[PDB]
Amino acid sequence: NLKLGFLVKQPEEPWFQTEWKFADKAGKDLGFEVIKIAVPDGEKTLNAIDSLAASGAKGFVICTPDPKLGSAIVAKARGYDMKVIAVDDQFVNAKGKPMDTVPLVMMAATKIGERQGQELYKEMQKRGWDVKESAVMAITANELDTARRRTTGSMDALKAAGFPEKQIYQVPTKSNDIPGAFDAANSMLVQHPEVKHWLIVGMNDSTVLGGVRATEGQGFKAADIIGIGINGVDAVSELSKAQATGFYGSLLGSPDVHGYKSSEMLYNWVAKDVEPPKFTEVTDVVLITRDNFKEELEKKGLGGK
Numbered sequence: 449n450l451k452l453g454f455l456v457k458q459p460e461e462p463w464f465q466t467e468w469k470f471a472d473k474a475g476k477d478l479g480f481e482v483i484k485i486a487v488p489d490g491e492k493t494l495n496a497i498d499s500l501a502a503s504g505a506k507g508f509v510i511c512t513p514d515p516k517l518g519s520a521i522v523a524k525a526r527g528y529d530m531k532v533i534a535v536d537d538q539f540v541n542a543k544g545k546p547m548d549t550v551p552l553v554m555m556a557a558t559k560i561g562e563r564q565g566q567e568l569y570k571e572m573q574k575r576g577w578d579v580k581e582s583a584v585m586a587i588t589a590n591e592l593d594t595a596r597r598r599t600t601g602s603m604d605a606l607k608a609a610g611f612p613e614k615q616i617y618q619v620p621t622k623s624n625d626i627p628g629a630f631d632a633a634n635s636m637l638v639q640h641p642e643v644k645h646w647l648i649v650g651m652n653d654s655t656v657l658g659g660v661r662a663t664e665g666q667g668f669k670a671a672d673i674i675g676i677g678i679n680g681v682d683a684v685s686e687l688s689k690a691q692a693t694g695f696y697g698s699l700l701g702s703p704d705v706h707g708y709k710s711s712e713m714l715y716n717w718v719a720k721d722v723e724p725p726k727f728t729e730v731t732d733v734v735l736i737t738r739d740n741f742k743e744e745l746e747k748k749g750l751g752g753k
């Protein structure tokens with residue numbers, strides 16, 4: 449019957465895999481087929497929409513590889529009589545202002561960022577680190593709003609908790625992955641020999657993991673590193689290791705909700721001109737660590753070690 453697209457920027461992330469999985473579920477529930485496409489860059493994005501059209505899809509959910517493609521995506525879709533819903537990453541105009549008109553479903557970025565900071569500080573306190581010889585490494589992707597609001601949130605929280613502002617070092621990453629974050633963290637590490645203990649701030653699991661990997665390379669032991677990721681699902685391989693690392697835990701969101709709900713809303717729209725709410729913010733979050741990850745996953749229905 450009805451065909452709907454589910455386009456994601458990073459198909460390799462468990463986050464996005466989970467959104468795909470739950471979109472499938474909505475498909476089975478509501479009676480539509482989900483066409484799952486990877487759109488890692490702008491070219492593939494625009495091409496992919498062309499393909500959808502050839503397939504006779506009525507609309508698509510998208511997590512764009514670039515928010516600035518917003519205009520183009522919308523123009524293309526319009527042309528094809530396709531309805532669009534954005535997941536995770538909000539469309540912006542040329543000027544960098546949000547395209548409010550496109551329905552969006554995303555995490556409560558600021559709130560989750562702030563929770564990251566809170567939990568970083570809590571764990572620091574637990575370990576009894578001397579603030580004097582501690583520092584925050586904030587690996588940023590400021591060109592992406594969602595990423596920005598997380599890392600700002602985190603930094604704000606740390607500062608509010610009384611972590612010295614002067615000891616917070618930001619470094620931009622060129623890619624939102626391990627390799628990117630690794631590179632960034634490495635360059636910051638060598639700049640600060642004075643630091644004995646690091647808090648690692650990053651918008652997601654991969655970013656923080658990259659940070660952790662770099663610290664290990666610069667001869668830091670797990671005890672001296674705290675990195676708390678965001679996503680949860682992305683962190684499972686890390687949390688499953690025999691030995692504890694600098695990667696302490698992750699804030700598990702609801703990619704299940706994002707996948708299912710975005711899909712379901714698109715369907716209602718396409719099938720019944722049921723106009724989605726412009727903004728859907730998902731506030732779920734739980735801290736998963738080495739101790740509780742398996743419970744919490746299975747509790748949330750994302751089972752399997």
Ligand SMILES: O[C@@H]1[C@@H](O)[C@@H](O)CO[C@H]1O
Nearest residue numbers: 463536537594624652679
């Ligand atoms: O890239 C991130 C992804 O890892 C998840 O955190 C959702 O938001 C996207 O911007």
